[PDB]
C-alpha cells in the first residue's frame, strides 16, 4: 500500500482550495469556508495498481504558522499553486514560494501548479489590469520558473470546469514518487 504526500503550498488567492476539491470530488463546491486544514486521500491507478494519494491542504496564511509546518514532515512533493493572472505571485513564486520549502527540503520534488484559469480567460479583467499594473503569466514564463526552481513540471488546472484539473495532480504524484 503506497501513498503520496502531496501538500498544497502557497500564500495568496489562487483558487487552491476549490481546485483541490473538484479534483477529488469531480464537482464544484458551494459553501465558503475551507481555508484551515483538510486532508484528502485519493485512490488512483498508478503503475497498474490502486495507489493512494495523500492530499494535504494548507491555510496559505501567516496567522496559522503554528499548525502550518505540521504538514511538512511527512511530505514528498509540493504543490505551488500560483495565480497566473497575478504577477505578484509569479515574482514570489520564484523568490518566496519555493524558497520557503528549499530551506526545509531543497531535494524533494516541486510541482508547479497554475490556477485561476476562469479569470485568465476573462479578457475583461486581463485587459483591465494588463495596462494598470497587473498582467497575466504566459506558459513559457511559468515553465522557466518550473526549471528555475527545479520544479518537476509546470501544469495549470481548474475546478469549475476541471480544465486540466486532475491532469496536474497526475504530474504531482508522478513527481513525488520515483524509479
Amino acid at each position: 500500500m503506497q501513498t503520496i504526500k502531496c501538500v498544497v503550498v502557497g500564500d495568496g488567492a489562487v483558487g487552491k482550495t476549490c481546485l483541490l476539491i473538484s479534483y477529488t470530488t469531480n464537482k464544484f463546491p458551494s459553501e465558503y469556508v475551507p481555508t484551515v486544514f483538510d486532508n484528502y486521500a485519493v485512490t488512483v491507478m498508478i503503475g497498474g495498481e490502486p495507489y493512494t494519494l495523500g492530499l494535504f491542504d494548507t491555510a496559505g496564511q501567516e496567522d496559522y504558522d503554528r499548525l502550518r509546518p505540521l504538514s511538512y514532515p511527512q511530505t514528498d512533493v509540493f504543490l505551488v499553486c500560483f495565480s497566473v493572472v497575478s504577477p505578484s505571485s509569479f515574482e514570489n513564486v520564484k523568490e518566496k514560494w519555493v524558497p520557503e520549502i528549499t530551506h526545509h527540503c531543497p531535494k524533494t520534488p516541486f510541482l508547479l501548479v497554475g490556477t485561476q484559469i476562469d479569470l485568465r480567460d476573462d479578457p475583461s479583467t486581463i485587459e483591465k489590469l494588463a495596462k494598470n499594473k497587473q498582467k497575466p503569466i504566459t506558459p513559457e514564463t511559468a515553465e522557466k520558473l518550473a526549471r528555475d526552481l527545479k520544479a518537476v513540471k509546470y501544469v495549470e488546472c481548474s475546478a469549475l470546469t476541471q480544465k486540466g484539473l486532475k491532469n496536474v495532480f497526475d504530474e504531482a504524484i508522478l513527481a513525488a514518487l520515483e524509479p
Partner: protein, 59 residues
Amino acid sequence: KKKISKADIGAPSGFKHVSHVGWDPQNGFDVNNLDPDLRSLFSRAGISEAQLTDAETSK
C-alpha cells in the same frame, strides 16, 4: 522499477476524508475528525487555546 509515467496515474477514484477542519468566527474551529498524529500537533499548535471538549463523550 517504481517509475511513474504521465500515463500511469489513472483517473482518481477514492476520495478519503482523512480529516475535516471547519473554522467558524462564531464557534471557532469545528473539527470532528482531525488526524491522529495531527490531533496532538493541532491542539499543540494553533488549537492550543484549550483542550478538545466539543461535546462530552457518550457513556
